[PDB]
Write a protein that binds this ligand. Structure first.
Ligand SMILES: *[C@@H]1O[C@H](CO)[C@@H](O)[C@H](O)[C@H]1NC(C)=O
Ligand SMILES: *[C@@H]1O[C@H](CO)[C@@H](O)[C@H](O)[C@H]1NC(C)=O
Ligand SMILES: *[C@@H]1O[C@H](CO)[C@@H](O)[C@H](O)[C@H]1NC(C)=O
Ligand SMILES: *[C@@H]1O[C@H](CO)[C@@H](O)[C@H](O)[C@H]1NC(C)=O
Ligand SMILES: *[C@@H]1O[C@H](CO)[C@@H](O)[C@H](O)[C@H]1NC(C)=O
Ligand SMILES: *[C@@H]1O[C@H](CO)[C@@H](O)[C@H](O)[C@H]1NC(C)=O
Ligand SMILES: *[C@@H]1O[C@H](CO)[C@@H](O)[C@H](O)[C@H]1NC(C)=O
Ligand SMILES: *[C@@H]1O[C@H](CO)[C@@H](O)[C@H](O)[C@H]1NC(C)=O
Ligand SMILES: *[C@@H]1O[C@H](CO)[C@@H](O)[C@H](O)[C@H]1NC(C)=O
Ligand SMILES: *[C@@H]1O[C@H](CO)[C@@H](O)[C@H](O)[C@H]1NC(C)=O
Ligand SMILES: *[C@@H]1O[C@H](CO)[C@@H](O)[C@H](O)[C@H]1NC(C)=O
Ligand SMILES: *[C@@H]1O[C@H](CO)[C@@H](O)[C@H](O)[C@H]1NC(C)=O
Ligand SMILES: *[C@@H]1O[C@H](CO)[C@@H](O)[C@H](O)[C@H]1NC(C)=O
Ligand SMILES: *[C@H]1O[C@H](CO)[C@@H](O)[C@H](O)[C@H]1NC(C)=O
Ligand SMILES: *[C@H]1O[C@H](CO)[C@@H](O)[C@H](O)[C@H]1NC(C)=O
Lengths: 229, 214, 224, 306, 181, 214
């Protein structure tokens, strides 16, 4: 019963090359055939290829032949996936996936296409943009729109890169009744999401609202006071 | 060259009920067909393989049926945790040229809930930046189908703006749209009224919520 | 590839009899190859003795009644073997005996004409020396002095003796003559060297004589 | 029979190489691997592996007998003798049209469905003296052996015990009567050579032949066993016999694979021992399918017309 | 009559080449005619030899008419004259396994002498020659030594085992010391 | 029996020469049943040609055979170093086969007169009761030489023996020993011992001598 570990998410620029690692542990390495399955944001699984490890042979996906390679280091027990000539569309979460094959070290081999063990997934952003912390802008609580019960307000993390971004309200307390939207890619090449929390108006002016946005990539942690302005 | 089409692009159904998914294949893939389940932000999950055999440690409510070019992952009394997108994988040809289905979202169908539109103006600080961002939230609603329109000075102009629905929630099990008209500084100042028209299914009638610069 | 391997040298008393052997490596069967025996007395030409052909043996007029020739097919441990027995040896039997083979498989070949043939493969030969002498180590005598000097290696039996000079360090200008057989039935030889007259009192010359059959080894200094 | 005397050399017979090359081509259009790896070097040490991936159709490869008829300008000569070394001058030679029907069975250690020895058990060898040259045994009475994809083969303990005897006796009758004869399992090497490998139903079986080659010229092994059961295993990744390199075949599928062949001969290979006391140790051998072909063409030789 | 030298615990590769580039029959035996390992066409056959679990060839090179005989975890005793019967040719190759092992810990005071012992096979007389980090080309046939281990010798030493046109390195670490400054 | 008489007994030649050796049979040999062999000093003969003109496998083609009437001849073109030695003809026409007396083929060289030396018996030999007088002829060509012994001026018959080396591989000369043997008794009786040598290189017969006890 193996556990697959992957290399870190990498931000590569167009026309470049990226190599993602995948540590295989918890069982006999050569008894597994590993497959890379990529998935672009919003998109769905796309078969990238599979390496019949023990044999050290790997077959690939038509639309990738030439620009992709799958190799395995039996010594360190790792599998690698290399894509060269990166395009923007290559931007996706590259999954490492494996399946048991049988006493392959003994000649037995099921050569299974499905994937029983999956990796945590490694995200690769292939874009011409540059790493840059975000900028949080408070969303004035609808004081002249909603009343009587509760009012909704929030933040607007705009122009950040590469990804991803975490969000919490009031240092991490008011995480309830909040709808943090998936980021969105702007024409510039940057992303921008939004976080909101519909809370009672009678609490505007005592509980200084502050969304806590973090962006490890840029190593820029931001806090913004959402005063009922 | 094999195409795997999962007809039900989206399937809204309620917990306890029986959900059915159908994967359609180009040529015959015999029985080399597997089914996966993916939670937003998670590695897929091998449910069924070989068409009709569940993976070690998987709820018996998931039924794997089919053979040839017609497979079916039918589920008895669907479960709260059973919400996810489902994928079928074809792995019968050789050389290896495996293909995936395009998917199927097994969303929870509930009561048609109307959206409470909150229009947020562009913070002056953000305007000092060089641009303006008007956020028109659409809280808690269901059928993710919610057409929104950005009317600037009653101008149906439809362009510089970008939506973003949220996943199905936990408790409420609703969606929340988020349309954002990002204008300039010199053009934001060039327009007076900024309206956001939400035309939802659960909305008795169109609901325009706007504001005038100030 | 045919290699014929004969038995070793023998020293035999007059009146005695001897059998010499020939192992025919590369020969299938004497059903397909004839054996012809031939001998060569020292400094003499060659003389036919007899044959075995198609398993049938025979001997030339000069040897009939005195010689038996046989052959047997063998495998594994040994190749096919032929042997030659000679009875009542005398001094005029002393010679090198050669075993010889010629394929008879192809009637049209031209190596053979109704049992009379040319000889296509030869053994090394075996010396049969017929003599009443008994083994005896040599005496070594100095031949004292461009000058010449040497050693007389006298009265030994049987052959060979070997001679080097200065344990082999002096080889240029050295002549070691073939042994001669004296009236006494013992051998004698000499070995000589030519050297510059100038070094005669400056350089040391010693002849190293070895007669292995008598286990004799002498080192003789040769002085003016 | 032909009234003439000719030379024969099964160990340098050319038909062997002509059939072998045929049997290989009889394999490239019947049993095609999903992947085939083969050495590829320029000589500079470094050696890339040439990979080939083709369809892997499951076919129940069932060998058809093969005849070998001389065309024209050519004639086949057969040797006739109850005990022919197959390497020398044959007396009762005789020209034939086609050689007997031969079922090109590729296997190691045991020769299956070959041709039995008319008289008694015969053992040929290009040189019995050389502990490197395979000894091809020829059974005069075959020993049925049934293998199944279920994981094993059954053999008659009786018949196999006898056979080892009537083989062990023919051995010392060549290496020295006053010599003890022993049988041990493979010394080592590739799975295909170490076990009794062969193909059945297109499945590459690998049967452990320890119980077949652990016979001491003293004791037995029939305690609570009527039949010998070799623990066999079907492999997908195998070393090719046609040429250095591995090859992966697709897993088994037919509800059942079964074989019932005649052990008509063996391929032994005694160990040198460096002239040690009479204690010749013979072990399974083969892997060079030509010896196989040989065991069938040992008494043939095609020749050009005169 | 090729000759190869090896270091105890290392892997040596006795070669053997066929005339043409064709995978043919070959076999590796030792002086006592004990079969080490040959080939069965495309299969590798390992014989009774004690080198069994450590012997091995290079399938890949067989097609280039090459049939080596790699011996790993080499032992002094693995030293011998391994024939290679190939296509009626006997490429008898020699194998010498030497082993240089210093005595006292790599750590040795200043001045004291350093003793090196070369484990070698019987009927083998090699001539060693280490080279201090500075330059001591001190010599020692079978057992070397550094009379006075000078403090400028405390470092990597480069020995050498000469035996028939061949030689094998044996880098050794040496540490000199003091009383202190 | 058929007699084969071979011609000449010796011939001298150079590398690159063409050489002819002949053999007359005492009867006609219609079938050409004649063979030629080479023998080098110390070794077994080797068959070169059989049936008069046929070359045995492996024999250089510079060797050829010919016949006219009762005469058979071996020809050697482009004479080579390994060719020097002794050649024999053999008839196998009629039983028993018989050989010629042989022909020695040696290396041609310019004339070189012997250096001549004479050695009296040593005192050690005289002590052991015998006396040998030795005369040496060193490095001469051609091989033909005469040496006569005289004591007290009296020609010596039957008490001497000669020994000759093989032709030297490097300077193509010969060397020869002659040993005069007599009892210690007669040796001590007479005064003057002389070696007289005659050779083509010598304009006149040379005498080396000594007086006993000098
Ligand atoms: C030699 O053989 C002859 C007949 O050839 C016979 O008379 C005589 O006894 C034999 N001589 C000896 C010493 O055996
Ligand atoms: C690999 O093998 C190829 C032979 O096709 C050779 O040309 C190349 O130099 C080798 N090196 C590589 C590319 O790994
Ligand atoms: C027959 O077998 C023997 C036994 O080894 C062998 O020596 C011989 O070459 C074979 N052929 C002949 C010539 O009979
Ligand atoms: C050969 O086979 C017969 C029966 O077919 C058997 O009786 C005989 O003993 C066998 N020869 C041997 C012992 O090899
Ligand atoms: C027979 O084998 C031995 C070694 O067992 C070998 O020395 C001999 O040369 C072989 N026979 C021939 C000449 O091929
Ligand atoms: C092998 O199978 C055959 C039927 O094909 C049967 O007659 C025989 O008894 C079997 N042999 C065994 C299991 O020993
Ligand atoms: C076996 O060897 C011989 C037969 O060649 C026989 O006379 C002897 O008594 C036996 N000795 C042994 C090896 O037991
Ligand atoms: C089967 O074979 C293996 C090696 O292939 C051996 O180690 C094992 O002991 C054998 N088992 C039997 C049936 O004795
Ligand atoms: C062979 O002998 C050994 C020891 O004497 C024994 O362990 C083994 O079982 C024997 N082989 C058989 C099974 O006949
Ligand atoms: C040994 O077992 C076999 C069956 O495996 C049986 O036929 C035989 O009779 C047994 N041996 C004896 C005679 O007890
Ligand atoms: C060949 O093998 C089959 C399979 O068991 C067997 O039944 C048949 O009798 C055998 N025929 C021969 C060659 O005797
Ligand atoms: C002949 O031998 C083969 C082994 O490959 C076996 O599969 C086949 O069944 C045998 N003949 C028969 C009885 O079918
Ligand atoms: C044969 O057995 C062993 C072989 O290892 C040997 O030591 C012994 O001297 C030989 N003879 C005996 C004692 O049986
Ligand atoms: C066949 O018999 C004839 C009888 O005239 C004979 O000439 C021929 O050599 C014989 N062939 C054989 C079998 O050797
Ligand atoms: C071959 O011919 C020989 C000679 O007559 C004869 O003894 C033998 O039986 C024949 N072999 C057969 C049966 O063809």
């Amino acid at each position: 019963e193996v556990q697959l570990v992957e290399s870190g998410a990498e931000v590569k620029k167009p026309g470049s090359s990226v190599k993602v690692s995948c540590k295989a542990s918890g069982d006999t390495f050569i008894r597994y055939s590993f497959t890379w399955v990529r998935q672009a944001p919003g998109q769905g699984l796309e078969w990238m290829g599979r390496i019949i490890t023990i044999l050290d042979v790997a077959h690939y996906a038509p639309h990738l032949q030439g620009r992709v390679t799958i190799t395995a280091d039996k010594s360190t027990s790792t599998v690698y996936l290399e894509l060269r000539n990166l395009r923007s569309d290559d931007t996706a979460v590259y999954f490492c996936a494996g399946v048991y094959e049988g006493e392959a070290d003994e000649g037995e081999y099921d050569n299974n296409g499905f994937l029983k063990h999956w990796g945590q997934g490694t995200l690769v952003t292939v874009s011409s943009a540059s790493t840059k912390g975000p900028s949080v802008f408070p969303l004035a609580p609808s004081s002249k729109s909603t009343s009587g019960g509760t009012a909704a307000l929030g933040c607007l993390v705009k122009d950040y890169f590469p990804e991803p971004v975490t969000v919490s309200w009031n240092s991490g307390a008011l995480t309830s009744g909040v709808h943090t939207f998936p980021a969105v890619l702007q024409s510039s090449g940057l992303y921008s999401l939004s976080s909101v929390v519909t809370v009672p108006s009678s609490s505007l002016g005592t509980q200084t609202y502050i969304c806590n946005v973090n962006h490890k990539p840029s190593n820029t942690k931001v806090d913004k006071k959402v005063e009922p302005k | 060259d094999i195409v795997m089409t999962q007809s039900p692009a989206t399937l809204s159904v309620s917990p306890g009920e029986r959900a059915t998914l159908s994967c359609r294949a180009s040529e015959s893939v015999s029985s080399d067909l597997a089914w996966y389940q993916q939670k937003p932000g998670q590695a897929p999950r091998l449910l069924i393989y070989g068409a009709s055999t569940r993976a070690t440690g998987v709820p018996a409510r998931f039924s794997g049926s089919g053979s040839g070019a017609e497979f079916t992952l039918t589920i008895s009394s669907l479960q709260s945790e059973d919400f996810a997108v489902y994928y079928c994988q074809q792995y019968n040809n050789w050389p290896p040229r495996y293909t995936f289905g395009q998917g199927t979202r097994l969303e929870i169908k509930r009561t048609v809930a109307a959206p409470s539109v909150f229009i947020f103006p562009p913070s002056d600080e953000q305007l000092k930046s060089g641009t303006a961002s008007v956020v028109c939230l659409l809280n808690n609603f269901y059928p993710r189908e919610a057409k929104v329109q950005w009317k600037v000075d009653n101008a149906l102009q439809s362009g510089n703006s970008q939506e973003s629905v949220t996943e199905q929630d936990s408790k409420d099990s609703t969606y929340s749209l988020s349309s954002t008209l990002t204008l300039s500084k010199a053009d934001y100042e060039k327009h007076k009224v900024y309206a956001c028209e939400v035309t939802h299914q659960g909305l008795s009638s169109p609901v325009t919520k706007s504001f005038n610069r100030g | 590839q045919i290699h014929l391997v004969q038995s070793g040298t023998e020293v035999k008393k007059p009146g005695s009899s001897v059998t010499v052997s020939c192992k025919a490596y590369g020969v299938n069967t004497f059903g397909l190859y004839a054996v012809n025996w031939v001998r060569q007395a020292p400094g003499q030409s060659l003389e036919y003795i007899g044959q075995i052909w198609r398993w049938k043996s025979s001997a030339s007029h000069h040897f009939r009644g005195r010689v038996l020739i046989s052959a047997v097919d063998l495998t594994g441990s040994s190749p096919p073997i032929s042997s030659l027995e000679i009875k009542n040896l005398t001094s005029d039997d002393t010679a090198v005996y050669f075993c010889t083979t010629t394929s008879t498989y192809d009637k049209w070949s031209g190596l053979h004409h109704d049992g009379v043939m040319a000889f296509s493969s030869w053994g090394q030969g075996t010396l049969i020396s017929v003599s009443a002498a008994s083994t005896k180590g040599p005496s070594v005598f100095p031949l004292a002095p461009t000058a010449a000097l040497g050693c007389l290696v006298k009265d030994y039996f049987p052959e060979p003796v070997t001679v080097s000079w200065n344990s082999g360090a002096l080889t240029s200008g050295v002549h070691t003559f073939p042994a001669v057989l004296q009236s006494s039935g013992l051998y004698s030889l000499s070995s000589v060297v030519t050297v510059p007259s100038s070094s005669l009192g400056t350089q040391t010359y010693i002849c190293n004589v070895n007669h292995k059959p008598s286990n004799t080894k002498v080192d003789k200094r040769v002085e003016p | 029979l032909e009234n003439v005397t000719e030379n024969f050399n099964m160990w340098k017979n050319n038909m062997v190489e002509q059939m072998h090359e045929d049997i290989i081509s009889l394999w490239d259009q019947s049993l095609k691997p999903c992947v085939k790896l083969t050495p590829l070097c320029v000589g500079a040490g470094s050696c890339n592996t040439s990979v080939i991936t083709q369809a892997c159709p499951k076919v129940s490869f069932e060998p058809i007998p093969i005849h070998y008829c001389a065309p024209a300008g050519f004639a086949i000569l057969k040797c006739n003798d109850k005990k022919f070394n197959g390497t020398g001058p044959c007396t009762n030679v005789s020209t034939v049209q086609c050689t007997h029907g031969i079922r090109p069975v590729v296997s190691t250690q045991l020769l299956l469905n070959g041709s039995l020895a008319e008289e008694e058990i015969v053992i040929r060898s290009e040189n019995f003296t050389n502990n490197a040259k395979t000894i091809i045994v020829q059974l005069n009475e075959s020993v049925v052996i049934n293998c199944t994809g279920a994981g094993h083969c059954n053999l008659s303990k009786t018949q196999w015990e006898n056979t080892l005897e009537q083989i062990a006796i023919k051995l010392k009758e060549q290496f020295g009567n006053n010599k003890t004869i022993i049988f041990n399992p493979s010394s080592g090497g590739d799975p295909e050579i170490v076990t009794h490998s062969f193909n059945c139903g297109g499945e590459f079986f690998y049967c452990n032949s320890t119980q077949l080659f652990t016979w001491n010229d003293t004791r037995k092994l029939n305690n609570t066993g009527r039949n010998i059961t070799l623990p066999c295993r079907i492999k997908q990744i195998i070393n090719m016999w046609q040429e250095v390199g591995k090859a992966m075949y697709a897993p088994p599928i037919r509800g059942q694979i079964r074989c019932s062949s005649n052990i008509t001969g063996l391929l032994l290979t005694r160990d040198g021992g460096k002239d040690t006391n009479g204690t010749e140790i013979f072990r399974p051998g083969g892997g060079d399918m030509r010896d196989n072909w040989r065991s069938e063409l040992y008494k043939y030789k095609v020749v050009k017309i005169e | 009559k090729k000759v190869v030298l090896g270091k105890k615990g290392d892997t040596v590769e006795l070669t053997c080449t066929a005339s043409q580039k064709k995978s043919i029959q070959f076999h590796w035996k030792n002086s006592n005619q004990i079969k080490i390992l040959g080939n069965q066409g495309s299969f590798l056959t390992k014989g009774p030899s004690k080198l069994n679990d450590r012997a091995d060839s290079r399938r890949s090179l067989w097609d280039q008419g090459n049939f080596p005989l790699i011996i790993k975890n080499l032992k002094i005793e693995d030293s011998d004259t391994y024939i290679c019967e190939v296509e009626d040719q006997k490429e008898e190759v020699q194998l010498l396994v030497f082993g240089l092992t210093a005595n006292s810990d790599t750590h040795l005071l200043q001045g004291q002498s350093l003793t090196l012992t070369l484990e070698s096979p019987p009927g083998s007389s090699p001539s060693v020659q280490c080279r201090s980090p500075r330059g001591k080309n001190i010599q020692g046939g079978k057992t070397l030594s550094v009379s006075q281990l000078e403090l400028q010798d405390s470092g990597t030493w480069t020995c050498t085992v000469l035996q028939n046109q061949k030689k094998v390195e044996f880098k050794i670490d040496i540490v000199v010391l003091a009383f202190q400054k």
